[PDB]
Amino acid sequence: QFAKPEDAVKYRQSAITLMASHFGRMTPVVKGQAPYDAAQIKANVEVLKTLSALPWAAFGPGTEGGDARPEIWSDAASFKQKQQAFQDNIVKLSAAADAGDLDKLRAAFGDVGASCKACHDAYRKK
């Protein structure tokens, strides 16, 4: 859907900004510093679920740029494993949110965060 590779970069960076905000805005809730409203979090995690699928389609062939390492492309199956682990952990976060349990939410949240970092460590430029 991108006229030029720059447009894929812009898209993925914007998708990531959104995803990161819908993830990170729950940090005070999982830490107990903000109240836990099960319906509020369930709705937010449904947004996050949609957003979490969007970046990966904007690393198509030819869309090198931004802070993406070239190894994303050179090792496409390996990158896909990092993406899949992350998406599987989002499924578990959805489950915890749907169950309305803060202890399960905080565990699932931490698993997602670990998956974010693992992909960055391999595939995001310093």
Place this chain on the structure above:
Amino acid sequence: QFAKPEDAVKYRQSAITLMASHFGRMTPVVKGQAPYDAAQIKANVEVLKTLSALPWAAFGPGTEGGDARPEIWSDAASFKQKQQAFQDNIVKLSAAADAGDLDKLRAAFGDVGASCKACHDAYRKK
């Protein structure tokens, strides 16, 4: 969810980038230049439906900036009407996509686009 007003600006601009891409990427389909796959469009419009709700929460009090005119805040009920007309036209686009009819899709698409422009004409800086 924003630490500083700048963060709301960044969020809304990213939300808009996404929304615009999921809207605009259908232009070749509504024009007939790309094939019409009803399932593909139904899925894309479901993404668009989620995205189309996101910008408006990031024009909260105190988040003046970017290319937002100050009248967004000064005339909050009026801005809300432009936002609601747009969101109602998204509901109609979802209906057309769910119905699998390209003639209804192209009409609903044009209605959404008109709603985008109407809000810009009043509330987006030149």
